[PDB]
Amino acid sequence: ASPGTAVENINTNVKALRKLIEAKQQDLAVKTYNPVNNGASYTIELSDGTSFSMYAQIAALEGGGEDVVYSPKVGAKVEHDEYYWTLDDVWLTFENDEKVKVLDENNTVAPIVDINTDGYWTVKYGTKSRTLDKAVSGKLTSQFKQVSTIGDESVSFTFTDRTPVIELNLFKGDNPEIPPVTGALRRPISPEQPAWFVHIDSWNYADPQKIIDLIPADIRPFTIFNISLSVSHDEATGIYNVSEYGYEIAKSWLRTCAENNVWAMVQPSSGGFSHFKDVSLYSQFESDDKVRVYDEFFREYPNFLGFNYCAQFWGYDDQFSVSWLQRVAHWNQLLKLTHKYGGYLVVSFCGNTWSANINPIALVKRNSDFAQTAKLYSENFIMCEKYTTQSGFFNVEGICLGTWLSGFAGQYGIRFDQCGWTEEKGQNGDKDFPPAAGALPIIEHVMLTGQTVIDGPELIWQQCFKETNAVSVGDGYQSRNWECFPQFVNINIDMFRKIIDKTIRIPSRKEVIDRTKVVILQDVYSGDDNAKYSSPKNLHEGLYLRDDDGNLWDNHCYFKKTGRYPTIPVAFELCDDVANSFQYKINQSTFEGSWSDVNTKVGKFNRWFPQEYTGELYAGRIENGWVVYNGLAGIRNAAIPFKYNTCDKMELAYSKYTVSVIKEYANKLTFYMNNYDPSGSSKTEVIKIYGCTSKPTHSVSSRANGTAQVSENWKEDVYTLTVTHNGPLDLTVNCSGKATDRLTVSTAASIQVPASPQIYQGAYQYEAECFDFKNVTKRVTKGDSEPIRNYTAQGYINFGASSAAAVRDAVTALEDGVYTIRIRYRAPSATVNTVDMYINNTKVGTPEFAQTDNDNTVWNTALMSVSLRKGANTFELKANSSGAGDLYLDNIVIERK
Ligand SMILES: [Ca+2]
Numbered sequence: 001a002s003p004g005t006a007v008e009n010i011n012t013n014v015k016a017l018r019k020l021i022e023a024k025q026q027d028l029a030v031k032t033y034n035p036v037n038n039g040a041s042y043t044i045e046l047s048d049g050t051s052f053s054m055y056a057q058i059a060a061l062e063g064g065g066e067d068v069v070y071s072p073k074v075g076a077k078v079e080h081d082e083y084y085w086t087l088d089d090v091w092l093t094f095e096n097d098e099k100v101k102v103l104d105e106n107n108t109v110a111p112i113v114d115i116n117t118d119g120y121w122t123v124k125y126g127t128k129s130r131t132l133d134k135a136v137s138g139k140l141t142s143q144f145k146q147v148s149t150i151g152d153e154s155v156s157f158t159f160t161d162r163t164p165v166i167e168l169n170l171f172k173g174d175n176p177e178i179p180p181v182t183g184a185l186r187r188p189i190s191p192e193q194p195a196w197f198v199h200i201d202s203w204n205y206a207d208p209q210k211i212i213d214l215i216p217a218d219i220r221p222f223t224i225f226n227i228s229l230s231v232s233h234d235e236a237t238g239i240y241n242v243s244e245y246g247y248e249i250a251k252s253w254l255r256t257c258a259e260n261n262v263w264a265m266v267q268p269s270s271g272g273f274s275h276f277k278d279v280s281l282y283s284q285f286e287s288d289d290k291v292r293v294y295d296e297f298f299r300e301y302p303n304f305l306g307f308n309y310c311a312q313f314w315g316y317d318d319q320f321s322v323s324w325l326q327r328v329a330h331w332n333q334l335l336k337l338t339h340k341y342g343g344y345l346v347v348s349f350c351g352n353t354w355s356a357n358i359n360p361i362a363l364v365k366r367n368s369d370f371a372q373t374a375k376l377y378s379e380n381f382i383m384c385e386k387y388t389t390q391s392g393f394f395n396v397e398g399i400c401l402g403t404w405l406s407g408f409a410g411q412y413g414i415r416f417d418q419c420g421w422t423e424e425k426g427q428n429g430d431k432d433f434p435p436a437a438g439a440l441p442i443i444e445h446v447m448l449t450g451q452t453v454i455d456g457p458e459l460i461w462q463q464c465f466k467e468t469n470a471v472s473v474g475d476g477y478q479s480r481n482w483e484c485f486p487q488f489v490n491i492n493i494d495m496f497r498k499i500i501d502k503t504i505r506i507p508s509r510k511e512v513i514d515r516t517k518v519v520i521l522q523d524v525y526s527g528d529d530n531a532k533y534s535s536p537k538n539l540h541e542g543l544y545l546r547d548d549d550g551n552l553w554d555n556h557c558y559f560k561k562t563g564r565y566p567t568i569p570v571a572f573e574l575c576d577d578v579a580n581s582f583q584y585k586i587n588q589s590t591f592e593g594s595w596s597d598v599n600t601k602v603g604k605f606n607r608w609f610p611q612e613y614t615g616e617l618y619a620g621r622i623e624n625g626w627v628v629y630n631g632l633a634g635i636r637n638a639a640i641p642f643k644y645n646t647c648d649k650m651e652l653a654y655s656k657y658t659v660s661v662i663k664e665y666a667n668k669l670t671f672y673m674n675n676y677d678p679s680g681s682s683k684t685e686v687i688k689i690y691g692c693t694s695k696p697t698h699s700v701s702s703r704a705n706g707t708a709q710v711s712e713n714w715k716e717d718v719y720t721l722t723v724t725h726n727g728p729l730d731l732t733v734n735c736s737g738k739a740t741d742r743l744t745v746s747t748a749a750s751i752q753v754p755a756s757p758q759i760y761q762g763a764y765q766y767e768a769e770c771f772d773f774k775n776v777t778k779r780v781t782k783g784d785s786e787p788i789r790n791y792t793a794q795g796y797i798n799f800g801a802s803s804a805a806a807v808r809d810a811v812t813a814l815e816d817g818v819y820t821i822r823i824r825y826r827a828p829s830a831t832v833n834t835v836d837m838y839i840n841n842t843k844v845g846t847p848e849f850a851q852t853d854n855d856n857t858v859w860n861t862a863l864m865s866v867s868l869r870k871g872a873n874t875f876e877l878k879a880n881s882s883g884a885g886d887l888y889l890d891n892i893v894i895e896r897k
Pocket residue numbers: 767768769791792793794795796889890891
């Protein structure tokens with residue numbers, strides 16, 4: 001398992017040292033190397049295709065000891081031209097002061113350290129065996145210190161004993177250069193080019209290909225795939241488990257994304273925890289071998305847009321995280337890099353009382369240098385509200401909005417999360433989170449407050465996608481299978497389609513500012529953290545706070561009671577002329593004196609925002625569009641006088657959690673309505689139209705998997721539509737009256753299909769844990785709890801020794817020609833030569849799966865050149881007879897020859 005043991009780590013380091021001395025003698029070069037868990041460990045790849053781990057941190061000995069204690073230090077030292085093993089810096093000997101050569105030349109045998117049944121350290125070499133000192137519980141030091149690049153042409157391995165530095169050539173002679181995409185935004189986001197962050201999640205143990213393929217073709221160009229690395233880790237050591245090898249996951253899945261010509265981001269962090277080391281200086285992105293990842297993904301993937309730091313409110317100042325200040329200083333640098341490559345930095349925030357001093361006000365109010373950079377590169381910076389915590393939704397909404405309106409962030413987004421549902425009690429007597437509830441804030445904030453990014457919804461593995469049982473796909477083979485949850489199809493996909501088809505017009509920043517009129521400026525420097533960084537305690541009271549709900553951290557519900565008033569933005573400073581065009585600017589310092597009196601505030605706000613309806617439904621208007629929803633139990637009503645339609649008014653009676661987008665025209669009304677229950681319950685809505693001078697007509701069509709039936713009634717000059725439905729529908733109503741006092745409708749929203757990435761010309765990758773399979777020994781889809789280390793993405797398979805074993809994958813090529821297939825494999829007990837490769841159902845040869853070193857971290861690379869055709873190709877490995885031993889398969893990599 002991924003925490004390793006002391007013995008395991010020790011013996012991995014000895015095997016590494018043998019390998020380095022072999023490489024030195026044979027003049028092998030280092031092809032790649034990569035720190036993990038902040039350099040607690042490294043994965044190394046040499047130019048013969050051997051890969052292995054090295055540990056800079058050793059796991060403690062069990063027993064809970066807290067002191068640093070003895071462990072055997074097995075090093076190596078040159079004598080008359082030959083390396084021989086050392087033990088605690090004397091020659092390692094067993095019997096007759098006989099020294100032991102590091103290279104036995106026909107073996108990979110190396111000293112093995114162990115602890116015996118008597119509790120004593122041992123070291124063995126072949127059949128020879130030596131008992132050392134009694135082990136004692138505690139912390140250990142490593143024999144290995146660090147690996148570092150020296151120049152840009154050499155790699156040095158440093159040890160902590162008297163073992164000499166081993167220097168190896170850095171392999172350089174790869175393909176010619178693929179120049180990076182720089183300058184302009186790689187993928188503009190705006191009201192016209194909204195984005196959906198759809199997650200490829202470690203918790204789904206994903207095949208990235210199968211998640212991408214779940215997204216409909218019309219949605220895909222507007223999708224950015226968010227490669228999500230769990231920060232689940234071992235408490236004692238901080239070592240990541242669920243996403244054990246984050247860099248490798250992100251790299252594999254980014255390749256698959258680039259191959260599929262879809263836009264992608266990497267999410268390495270929730271809270272303080274991050275798979276990648278934070279920087280403090282820009283220079284590090286090119287000069288610092290511990291943080292290669294950041295420049296690398298931008299440089300090598302034209303579809304890569306940058307890094308998403310989610311839920312930035314928890315987990316700081318951990319032994320294995322950073323301070324929030326360090327995180328911001330990281331962002332200061334990463335924003336510059338993002339800018340160069342035309343990407344985005346995404347941050348998302350959810351609050352509680354203890355995270356006020358690190359919220360989006362604090363972000364700029366406490367960090368002047370960061371604030372400068374954010375303002376300078378606001379187009380590359382995206383701020384998102386997150387619905388994860390139990391309270392403060394309006395507080396956090398207003399502050400995140402504020403960051404964008406004020407000029408610090410270039411876009412604003414929502415990361416909706418089921419976890420916001422109030423624990424124990426829920427809302428409206430609904431203990432369990434109903435998916436339909438989540439449509440309400442998203443539609444509201446997108447259409448009324450100009451969010452251009454939707455993220456999730458969370459939890460990904462309960463609201464978007466799930467792995468099912470493997471499915472039979474014919475020919476003996478079985479296949480891992482992922483499906484969308486029904487709510488994803490009937491809420492989130494269908495909603496985004498309403499943005500694309502121009503029903504849900506997203507307002508521009510300037511449009512939001514002109515509608516909003518008022519901003520709070522957080523200019524308090526005295527009192528506690530909430531006084532200095534949070535919005536006024538009672539800002540929302542008497543406005544859109546529900547009667548049953550509390551202020552600030554007692555605000556448990558994100559359904560607004562009315563839409564008379566816009567979301568009130570709370571900002572630190574107004575950075576540009578657009579920010580400074582706010583009609584009303586209230587300094588928060590003056591809030592206690594005047595505005596803290598709810599009635600005074602309501603009076604002022606009532607003059608700024610006219611009453612445009614009555615009733616208990618939420619209704620909010622922007623141009624000829626309404627967002628109307630029922631956030632309460634029961635069927636609830638509104639009376640809404642038309643502003644564009646030539647009839648008089650409508651009365652609405654809506655079921656609980658029904659949301660609607662209503663477009664008024666002079667002689668027409670459209671209604672997009674949703675209320676999706678996966679369990680298949682129907683809801684009733686009633687719509688009454690007053691003041692039609694002739695009988696109206698209607699048409700309806702249900703959307704996605706919705707059912708709908710609509711009946712009409714014409715009597716007493718009132719047109720009544722009853723709508724019974726589960727899920728989404730579009731209803732058109734042709735109604736007209738004699739009103740002349742009405743506004744005029746604008747031309748239709750522009751929606752522009754976002755252009756595709758530049759075509760990726762790099763190497764493709766396919767994980768063996770994602771292959772179709774039959775008669776394999778074991779499939780490790782979750783590698784952290786198993787004994788093999790140093791794998792790519794989240795797993796590997798033991799293909800095994802059955803004569804009927806076989807794996808298959810669909811791979812692609814840009815054009816016909818010869819490609820090299822690198823097969824990453826273990827064969828620890830014997831050479832496997834009974835396994836044939838088939839390309840497009842034709843045998844092309846038998847890979848040499850030469851016997852690999854016995855260490856649990858060691859993988860090797862077998863190579864085959866094959867002809868691929870343009871487009872989809874079939875790759876298979878098939879046993880022809882029983883294997884001489886187990887074959888492990890991690891991945892294949894394919895590149896043009
Ligand atoms: Ca793998």
